[PDB]
């Protein structure tokens, strides 16, 4: 053993002695060897879940699960069953498919996982600090509970007419559209979605006042801001570049521009129920009574109108590109606006879009076939011991969920590649919690999670925006299917998603064809 020692201290100089290639080569090697013979040696551990092979240290399977992660989930399955394990980029990912990972992940204990682990590096550069995932969860509910306050049904009713008006507004003001000079155009609706969601839902949920600064330059500090959100800043959240600058820039300037409303409503006493300003001016000290700084309220308006803007423009970009292949549903759709709204005669409110339950199944079904968030993660900051097995998925992993995968299984949603709006009949509600209930600090939410179905998550970390966005695209789509018809450019059909991006949205460009329903229709104003 002593001489053994010795050797071993001369083996050490004389890895120096070598030539530097060999060195470098040696410094590369070694990594990829220990890698392959500590997975073999994983593979024998029966209190962890099978770990995806993989050849490449640390990189792990970010490129197959990076390009086509359901892809890559049904092979997993197949092989090892609905819980495994993956490298990606130096983290292990502990993935529970199906409605018991829905209940593993968003029913875990506070103590057991963390979400804003996962995401501070994703969102706090953009949003800003003090807020969503740069503070404590404690923090996160009351937030979530302050912004709930401006989304109420009262809310809602006040709100649809608005967004109406800005829909018809884009289309006779939009380039993409003209509709008082042109009676058919093409349009790439990942151009005209993501604008007319920013301008419905800055006009509802931030004003009269922040929906005007869109019609100057100013607008070009959102697209900067928006420019931002990108999941590169898993890794890279700050870099030396111009892209950073110009986000940053566009975040200080963007939530100044948010702050000088806020003081100059409070400096004039003029604080009314107008919007989300508003409210959370007046409802924004958290229980143990701090207040949220002016700079913490823009923070989080920013966050929620920007978490808000892509996964309803996504949503809204693949309802038009499903709905142009099935003139079949424009139909019934149009027959069902014809029919609540008196052939027109009536005007849209709210109360009248829960009279339109395929509208609104048509928006579920984009939503199960197109999951905005293909996977939600926790770090794991407790071990935790997975049911009926003997796993233990120990603290500095991440465990995944994916609600999205499981929309797409034949198992629970037959035919789970065919759009079919009427798999929900008589289930058209955009959620429904059928029984325990439970309050995590932002309302009576439901307790179990187990539903294959959930678009917009559950437990504490679930969706508040859920029925903001069905008033949003009820209107949206509402006003679309009375005016418009649309089709495919001639041999084109539904795109992929890109799975890489910020949420699933279609592949580019993804062109439709509209033509007025009514050539001679004027839009005023
Ligand atoms: C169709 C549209 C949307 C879908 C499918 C969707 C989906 C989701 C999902 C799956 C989560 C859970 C995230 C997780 O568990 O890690 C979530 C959380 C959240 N969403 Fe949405 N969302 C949508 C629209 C909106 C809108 C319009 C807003 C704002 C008005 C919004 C604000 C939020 C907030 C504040 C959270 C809480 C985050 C947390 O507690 O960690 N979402 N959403
Ligand atoms: C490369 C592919 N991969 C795998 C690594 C990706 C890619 C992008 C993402 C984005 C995610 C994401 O943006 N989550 C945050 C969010 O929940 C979103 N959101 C909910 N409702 C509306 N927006 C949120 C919640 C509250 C809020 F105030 C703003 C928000 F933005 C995410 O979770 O995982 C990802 C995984
Ligand atoms: O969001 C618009 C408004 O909705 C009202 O019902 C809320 O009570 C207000 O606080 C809010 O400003």
Redesign the pocket.
């Given at each position: 053993v002593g001489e053994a020692l010795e050797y071993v201290n001369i083996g050490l100089s004389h890895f120096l002695a070598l030539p530097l290639a060999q060195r470098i080569s040696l410094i590369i090697i070694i990594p990829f060897i220990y890698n392959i013979v500590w997975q073999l040696l994983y593979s024998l551990r029966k209190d962890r879940p099978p770990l995806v092979f993989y050849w490449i240290p640390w990189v792990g399977s970010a490129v197959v699960y990076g390009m086509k992660p359901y892809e890559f989930f049904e092979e997993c399955q197949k092989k090892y069953g609905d819980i495994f394990s993956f490298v990606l980029l130096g983290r292990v990912m502990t993935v529970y498919l199906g409605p018991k990972g829905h209940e593993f992940v968003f029913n875990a204990k506070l103590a057991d996982v963390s979400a804003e682990a996962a995401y501070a590096h994703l969102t706090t550069p953009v949003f800003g600090k003090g807020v969503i995932y740069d503070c404590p969860n404690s923090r996160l509910m009351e937030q979530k509970k302050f912004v709930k306050?401006?989304?109420?049904k009262?809310?809602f009713k006040?709100?649809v007419p608005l967004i109406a008006e800005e829909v018809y507004k884009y289309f006779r003001d939009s380039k993409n559209f003209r509709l008082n000079e042109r009676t058919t155009g093409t349009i790439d609706v990942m151009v005209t979605q993501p604008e007319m969601t920013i301008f419905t839902a800055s006009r509802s949920?931030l004003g009269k006042e922040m929906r005007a600064k869109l019609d100057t330059d100013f607008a070009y500090l959102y697209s900067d801001l928006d420019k931002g959100f990108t999941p590169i800043n898993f890794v890279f959240p700050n870099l030396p570049l111009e892209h950073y600058r110009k986000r940053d820039h566009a975040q200080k300037a963007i939530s100044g521009t948010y702050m000088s409303l806020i003081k100059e409503r409070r400096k004039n006493n003029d604080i009314?129920?107008?919007?989300?300003i508003?409210?959370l001016m007046?409802?924004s000290t958290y229980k143990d009574g701090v207040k949220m700084t002016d700079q913490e309220i823009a923070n989080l308006l920013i966050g929620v109108l920007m978490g808000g803007q892509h996964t309803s423009a996504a949503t809204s970009a693949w309802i038009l590109l499903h709905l142009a292949e099935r003139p079949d549903v424009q139909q019934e759709l149009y027959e069902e606006q014809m029919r609540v709204l008196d052939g027109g005669k009536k005007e849209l409110t709210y109360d009248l879009l829960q009279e339109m339950p395929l509208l609104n199944q048509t928006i579920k079904e984009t939503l199960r076939m197109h999951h905005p968030l293909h996977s939600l993660f926790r770090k794991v900051m407790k071990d935790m011991h997975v049911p009926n097995t003997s796993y233990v998925i120990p603290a500095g992993y991440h465990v995944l969920v994916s609600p999205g995968y499981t929309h797409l299984r034949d198992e629970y949603f037959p035919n789970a590649h065919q759009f079919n709006i009427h798999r929900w009949n008589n289930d058209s509600a955009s959620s429904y919690s059928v029984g325990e209930e439970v309050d995590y600090g932002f309302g009576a939410i439901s307790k179990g999670v187990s539903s294959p179905y959930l678009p917009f998550g559950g437990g504490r970390h679930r969706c508040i925006g859920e029925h903001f966005a069905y008033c949003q695209l009820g209107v949206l789509m509402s006003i679309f299917i009375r005016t418009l018809k649309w089709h495919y450019p001639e041999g084109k059909t539904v795109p992929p998603p890109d799975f890489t991006s910020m949420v699933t949205l279609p592949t580019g460009p993804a062109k439709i064809i509209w033509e007025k329903r009514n050539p001679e229709q004027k839009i005023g104003g």
């Open positions: 306050g401006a989304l109420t009262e809310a006040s709100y949920l009314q129920d107008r919007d989300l508003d409210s007046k409802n």
